[PDB]
Structure formats: C-alpha cells, structure tokens
Design a protein around this nucleic acid. Structure first.
Ligand SMILES: [Mg+2]
Ligand SMILES: [Mg+2]
Ligand SMILES: [Mg+2]
Ligand SMILES: [Mg+2]
Ligand SMILES: [Mg+2]
Ligand SMILES: [Mg+2]
Ligand SMILES: [Mg+2]
Ligand SMILES: [Mg+2]
Ligand SMILES: [Mg+2]
Ligand SMILES: [Mg+2]
Ligand SMILES: [Mg+2]
Lengths: 200, 95, 52, 104, 207
RNA sequence: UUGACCUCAAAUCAGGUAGGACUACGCGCUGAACUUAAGCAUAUCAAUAAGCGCAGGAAAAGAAAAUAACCAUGAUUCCCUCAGUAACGGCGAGUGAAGCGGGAAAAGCUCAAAUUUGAAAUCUGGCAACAUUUCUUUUGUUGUCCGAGUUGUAAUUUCAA
RNA sequence: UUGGAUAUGCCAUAUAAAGCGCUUUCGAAGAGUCGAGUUGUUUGGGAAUGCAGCUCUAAAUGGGUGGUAAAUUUCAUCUAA
RNA sequence: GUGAAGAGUUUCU
C-alpha cells in the first residue's frame, strides 16, 4: 500500500522533493512554540511502525531541541579540581537530543505515557522531533490488549528512566561482548561486592 | 575429514545432514514488489547531489576520482564500489 | 565489631566422621561413662541395647 | 448497510445465502492503501487525487505510479469534496474500478 | 613497607569495599525457602512431573564435546520426526527450541528417541473428564507425579572395552600423521597462492 | 450569503488525569576532592560522596543484528567457577572483564510492513434498560444515537515463519 | 468453591473454527538509521568497548558480529534501527 | 537559497 512507498521515499533525504519540504516545514516549525501539538503525524508510516495508531488516546507532540554539546555550567569556566576535570567547552551530554525531546514533552503532558519518538527535521540550531504519547486513562487504551501494558504503574515516566527505544540505546543496553558494561551500576555492583560465605 | 584434531578437515566424523531453511536468512533478497516500489521512488525523488557528482565523474571516465568521492561520501570502499556499480547501471540504462 | 567476622568453622568430612566414630567407641567403655559423670553403676551391660 | 443486513438475515433463514438476496456493489473505491493496491493491480479505471493532502508525501508518488501502470488519473480540488462522496470528512484519493453499463 | 618473604601483595581493597560486603547468614534460610517453593509447586502441578523433559546435547568446544548434557528444548525437526506438533508440544510438557538445529543424524536420532520414550510413558488426561479422545488415555487411575530423570536419564557415551589390533593400526604412525596434518593446514594458503603463480604466470607462454 | 473541510482558540463546558511524601533495595543524569602514587600533573580514590529526574513490590534485563570455531550451544537474571586470569597502566602505584562448565529458576511472545474492498468487519462517549459486586461504594452487557476512524480502526501473518 | 472427583445431578455449550498432507508461485521484514570520520567521555577492550556532539551518510543476499589498522576472497553466525 | 557577467566536463571573484 502507501506505507511502503512512504518508507522508501523517507530514505531520500537529499532529493529535491524532500529538501524543499524540509525547508518549508522547518520554517513553519520555527514559527510556533518550542513544544506544540501536532494534529496528525507528519510521517504517518514512521508513526505506525513505532506503535502509533489512529485511535483516540494516541497523541502526537512536536518539539525542537537545541543542537550541539553541553557547556559545563560552572561560573567562569572555573572547575576547582585537577586538570583532567578543567574542561568546559568540548563536552557532551550522555543522553541523546531525542531523549531530551521525550523528557520535555513528557513533563508537558504529565497525564500521558511517552511511547516513542522520531526525528522529523533539523537546521543548524535545532533538531525537530515528534513524540508519540498514549493516554492511560482513556477507555480505548485500557481495553486494548496490544497497548494495555502501558497503563500499569511500572511504566510511569518510562522516558525519565531510559526505558523508551532511545533511552535504552543511550544506556548501552544490548546483547553480547560489546555491551559488557551492561546496565552500568548493576554490573559494577556485581564486580565490587565482596562475597563472604559461611565457610562451614 | 580425517577424524583428527589437526589438519584441514579436522574433527569427529558424524553423519552429515541438510539443515532446514531458516527464513531469517532470506533477508537481503530483492522482492519484486519492493523493486517496483523503489523504481517508482527513484522516479519521484531524483538523485542525491553526491550521486550526481559521482555519475558525472563516471561519465567523464574519471574512474579513480569517482571511487575516491563515493568512498569519501559513504564511508567505506565496499559501499562505494556497490554505489558506483549501481550508478554505472543507471548511466548505461539511459544510453 | 563487624558482622562479617568468621562465625562458622569448616572441618574435613573425614575428620568429622573420625570424631563421631571415636565418640561412639567411647560410649562402649564403662570407665569413660563413669568418668564423664553418668550414674551407670547398676546398668546390666555396655553398650545398653533395648528391644524394638 | 443496516437495511441490507436485515434483508440478508431474512433471506438466510429459509432461502439461500446473502448472495441470493443482494447484488454486487458498484461504488467508488477509497482509502489510500487500498487505492494504491488497485493501481498496482491495474484495476483502477480512474484515480482522483486530492489537491491539498497536507503531508503531501502520502500522494506525491501517485501520478508517477498511475502513469507507470497506465491508469488514468486527475488531480482535483478538495480532499474535503472527495470525502463527501464517500460519507467521510476527507479522502486523500478515490478510485473508480467498475461502472455500470449505462455509465460506460 | 615490603620486607618479608613471599608474594608481592595484590589486595584490591582501595575502594569503600566495606560498604558492599555480602554475607551469607541467610544461606540456610534461602535453602529452606527454595525447597518449600519446590514442594508448593509440585503439589500445584501434580500429577505432572516437576521438571520438563529436556533434550540431550553435546557441549561446545574441545574441552567438553566429549560429554553429554541436558539442553534447552527439542528442535523443530526433532519434534516433526517424533510426530509432535510444535503447538501441542508445550501443552504436554515438551519444550521447543527454535534456535537449535540438527547438524548430524546422531543428534536428531538421540533426541527423537527421548521424545518417543516420553510419549510412551505419558498419560494425557482427556480435556473433558470421562470422555476420552484421540491422543489421550483411558487408564488415568494410576497417575502419579514421577521424575523424568527416573525414566529418561541423560546417558554419557560408552566405550569399546577391548578389540583386536589390526595390521593397519600396527602400521599407523600417529606422531608423524599429527606433524604432517598440522604442516598441511599451516601451508595451505602458501600452496594455494603458489598454484595461482604456477598456472597463471605460465599463460603468457601460449602467446 | 450559507454550508463543508482544514488549522487555530475559548468556556467554573461533560468526564478524567499529573504534582507532594517515603528512597533500604531499583533505573538514569550530573559529578568532586581528601586519598594512594612515599613529591606530582596522567593514573588512583571513583564511572564513588554531594546535586537532579523517575519507579515497584521488587526494579532493571529478557526471547539473540548471542556464542562459538565444537560431535557444537541456544531469551533474561542470580550463584560457583572461569580469575586477580586475557587485558589496561608515568606497563609506575594500581586496575581488570568474557565465552565454555556446574547450579537456582525456567515461558514465551506482540507489532509495523499485505486489497476485508461482495460491503470499518474496529473503537470512545451520551441516553435507556438489564445484569454484577470485597462493595447501594465494584464490574460489565445489550439497544440506540453521536463522535473517532479510510492521512486506516479490525481480521490472517511476525521470518521459529 | 467446576482448583481437583463419577466433580456427579445436569447446563447446552457444538455446526464451524484448528491439526497434519502433496504441489506450486511466492514470501511486504523498522533510515538522519546503520555505517564512516572526528571531538569529548568511558571501558579490561589494546591503530575507539559503550555513550554523546558535529560532518558525511547507506544497502538488498543486503546488513551486523567474528576483540590488530588496510585492500581483496572465502567461511560461520545473527537479522538492528 | 535564487539569479547575472567574467576564469584559464567543471567552482573562483
Ligand atoms: Mg522492558
Ligand atoms: Mg602523594
Ligand atoms: Mg605521604
Ligand atoms: Mg602534596
Ligand atoms: Mg548520591
Ligand atoms: Mg507503592
Ligand atoms: Mg519490569
Ligand atoms: Mg525473534
Ligand atoms: Mg576503575
Ligand atoms: Mg526487524
Ligand atoms: Mg561524565
């Protein structure tokens, strides 16, 4: 159907069609609020594959996030420590800008659950994302076995605990030798806990 | 297959048998519907600017320059050689 | 004081079994029963075995 | 639809199936995924593409797809006017597959 | 400072290790808890066996491939050859491993035999009591919770106790064969690269 | 002129919902220095203290874009072992995992990508009736109408196919 | 309190949905993502282990992994976003 | 981003 065509065309971000549409939409986005409601997904095919459905209780929000690194917020570049910690400028936040987009939209919609998010645009100053949210109080959500899980209280603010797709990526959650540091603190605890058995 | 632990065909000799098809290994095949969709999309979307630059170097018979540019644009040489072959087919498709 | 002081002591299984064997053998010796404080002056036999 | 179903129900008790009392429907096809499949299968005789589909990528490939498949197509005003035909608020695209003999 | 006999010291106790000391004072308590959970589970699923039947597989690597151990579940081919549908397997306590495959007939036949022995000892109760159906049993009265390991143990591979010494064995040179085979694998690449140079650079001789 | 659609508002609109606290344990962010190196800057202390966000009865992880290199294994977690080892390190002081093996427990699955197209088969809300209850306090069913929804709600499928 | 039993005694669920079975042609599979460079940080991970910024930016038997950088050819194994 | 001259299939003022 149309979804395959939208998926393939979305891969062509340098084509004349997508370059033009990106320019006009980025201009339009910069004219409205940093966080604003989207009436519909700008990328319906991308939204579906990330869990979105066109039913009551699913909500799309758009947000722009400042690009670039994290300047150390210390008074006059003064760090009061050893030279290894004197850096102020070329530093980087450990969470993705997409994660920040989810965090801020989740605070903005504190009655909703953040499901997922996707990139839509960027200029030199901002990256634009659309965040998919679900109303756990809506009956259409609570009676739906495919999205029911998110009502349970263990899924409260899953974006704040790195439990969305981008949150687990930023946490380095993965299988095998490349992710041995694993959940870091839990792995660290296992290796730094002295185990003293009853030798009898 | 000597049945030793050294040499070319080492290891214990058992009765070999044909493993069944794993459909996950079909990935990477080109379905006819997907090929049709991509040809339509290539019609609607054009070529990326670097693709046009590479094709121009191909059309001027600057084969090394095209390889250097495609590798520089895409990262690896392996992706470059695949891209140059694809753009070469496009160029000859128009001829 | 800390809880992770060593409270339990391992003994080799064979030494434990040696100890119990010695203790059972000592129970068959009337002098050792008397020496250990047991008032066994009147019992008919050592070891003392009663019906099932 | 409710009237058709009560007819099929009444005729499914003593007669034959619902096919015996209802005829083949002749109607415009709608739904973007459904119409795309019809075009790829060469069953659309005429495709009417709304002119103001707001995320335009939903239909931007449709003229190229229609031209490739040799199905006639027109870009027409008001997705809202197309929606009125099919009793919806809006419709991105409509397709004619079959027309009665009197309209050929 | 260091002045005594012995190993140079190595103790990794420069962090706040006393904060994360793990003691085992609950070891008998945990053992009692786990046994009570097993007893509670056994009474709940009775008369089903407490443990599901498992396949026999060979451990990987040369250190353990001489042994046999329980695996996760039976392969799709093994279930097929034993006449058990994969959707039915779980309903009667037969685990399914979609990941493991049978690279040899020996692995397949060994586990197909385990399933056949399981099925022959299995009493399937009818879904509706007193109305036996196909694949069920009509003598369910003597049903009790039994160990699968009592019926289908994991058996290690046996040996030839003794056998004649043939003239072929007497002429075999074990050490030379090991040295030759290692050398042949070692210089296969040079031989292959040589063969290219043996037959390709000679092509100019034709013209 | 009206109406439709789109986008955007307002209302003490009808019904909901979030915040604060508890932080032993849990998931993240941010982040020292004392200290050790017989000085000291890399290093170490430490991916620690302090600071900030967010949960539950556990959390997190989880049905391989995993191992291996075998006669192969088979989601995750935890224990023992691997192992103070491979490795890192002014190769100084110091630091330091993983595969196999044994054991505890075991459980497997859901979507998106498909034309239902001889029938949006889907869902919420209002109203009414009828049931139901840890419970006049709970939880539904049917009818009807209105909304949602074709810019796609259901149904068969999820690669093991 | 159908959890088990003749779970009896009975409700009337039960008429159309699954199992294997030969033959075909098939078999849609997640993108500013993977990957590359570079900077910072982190790791036991060593011509980059994970994370993040910025630049470049994919493919269709493709793509990932196979703990020494690179080019090529094989093989194995997995099937990301 | 969009257009015009000039420079020994191109990007520089
Ligand atoms: Mg999870
Ligand atoms: Mg010092
Ligand atoms: Mg000192
Ligand atoms: Mg000092
Ligand atoms: Mg703290
Ligand atoms: Mg609580
Ligand atoms: Mg959980
Ligand atoms: Mg899978
Ligand atoms: Mg450290
Ligand atoms: Mg996938
Ligand atoms: Mg940091």
């Amino acid at each position: 159907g149309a979804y395959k065509y939208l998926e393939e065309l979305a891969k062509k971000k340098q084509s004349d069609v997508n370059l033009f549409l990106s320019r006009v939409r980025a201009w339009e986005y910069r004219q409205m609020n940093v966080i604003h409601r989207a009436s519909r997904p700008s990328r319906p095919d991308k939204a579906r594959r990330l869990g979105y459905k066109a039913k009551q209780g699913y909500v799309i929000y758009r947000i722009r996030v400042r690009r670039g690194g994290r300047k150390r917020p210390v008074p006059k570049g003064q760090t009061y420590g050893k030279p290894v910690h004197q850096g102020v400028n070329h530093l980087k936040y450990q969470r993705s800008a997409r994660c920040t987009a989810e965090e801020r939209v989740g605070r903005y919609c504190s009655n909703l659950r953040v499901l997922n998010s996707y990139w839509v645009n960027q200029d030199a100053t901002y990256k634009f994302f659309e965040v998919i949210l679900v109303d756990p109080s809506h009956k259409a959500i609570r009676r739906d076995p495919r999205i029911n899980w998110i009502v349970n209280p263990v899924h409260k603010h899953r974006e704040s605990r790195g439990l969305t797709s981008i949150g687990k990526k930023s946490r380095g959650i993965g299988k095998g030798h490349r992710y041995n540091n694993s959940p870091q603190h839990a792995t660290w605890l296992r290796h730094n806990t002295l185990s003293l058995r009853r030798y009898r | 297959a000597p049945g030793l632990v050294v040499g070319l065909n080492k290891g214990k000799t058992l009765t070999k048998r044909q493993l069944p098809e794993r459909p996950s290994r079909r990935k990477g095949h080109l379905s006819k519907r997907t090929a049709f969709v991509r040809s339509i999309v290539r019609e609607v979307a054009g070529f990326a600017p670097y693709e046009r630059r590479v094709m121009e170097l191909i059309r001027n018979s600057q084969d090394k320059r095209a390889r250097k540019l495609a590798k520089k644009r895409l990262g690896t040489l392996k992706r470059a050689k695949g891209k140059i072959e694809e753009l070469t087919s496009v160029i000859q498709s128009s001829r | 004081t800390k809880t992770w002081r060593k409270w339990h002591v391992k003994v080799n299984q064979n030494e434990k079994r040696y100890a119990i064997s010695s203790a059972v053998a000592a129970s068959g010796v009337p002098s050792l029963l008397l020496a250990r404080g047991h008032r066994i002056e009147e019992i008919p036999e050592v070891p003392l075995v009663v019906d099932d | 639809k409710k009237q058709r179903l009560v007819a099929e129900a009444e005729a499914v008790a003593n007669g034959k199936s619902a096919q015996d009392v209802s005829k083949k429907p002749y109607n415009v096809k709608y739904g973007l995924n459904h119409v795309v499949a019809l075009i790829e299968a060469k069953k659309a005789k005429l495709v009417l593409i709304a002119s103001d589909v707001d995320p335009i990528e939903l239909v931007v490939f449709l003229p190229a797809l229609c031209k490739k498949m040799g199905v006639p197509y027109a870009i027409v005003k008001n997705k809202a006017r197309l929606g009125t035909v099919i009793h919806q608020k809006t419709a991105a695209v409509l397709a004619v597959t079959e027309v009665r003999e009197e309209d050929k | 400072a260091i002045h005594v006999k012995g190993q140079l010291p190595n103790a990794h106790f420069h962090k706040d290790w006393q904060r994360y000391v793990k003691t085992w004072f609950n070891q008998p308590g945990r053992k009692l808890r786990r046994r009570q959970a097993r007893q509670t589970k056994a009474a709940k699923i009775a008369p089903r066996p407490v443990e599901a039947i498992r396949p026999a597989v060979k451990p990987p690597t040369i250190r353990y491939n001489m042994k046999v151990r329980a695996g996760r579940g039976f392969t799709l081919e093994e279930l097929k050859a034993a006449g058990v549908s994969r959707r039915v397997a779980s309903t009667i306590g037969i685990p399914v491993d979609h990941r493991r495959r049978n690279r040899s007939e020996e692995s397949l036949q060994r586990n197909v035999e385990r399933i056949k022995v399981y099925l022959a000892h299995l009493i399937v109760f009818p879904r509706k009591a007193g109305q036996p159906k196909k694949g069920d049993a009509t003598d369910v009265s003597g049903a009790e919770q039994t160990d699968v390991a009592a019926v289908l143990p994991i058996t290690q591979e046996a040996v030839e106790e003794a056998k004649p010494i043939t003239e072929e064995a007497k002429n075999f040179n074990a050490f030379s064969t090991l040295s030759n085979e290692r050398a042949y694998a070692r210089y296969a690449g040079a031989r292959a690269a040589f063969q290219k140079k043996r037959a390709e650079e000679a092509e100019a001789k034709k013209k």
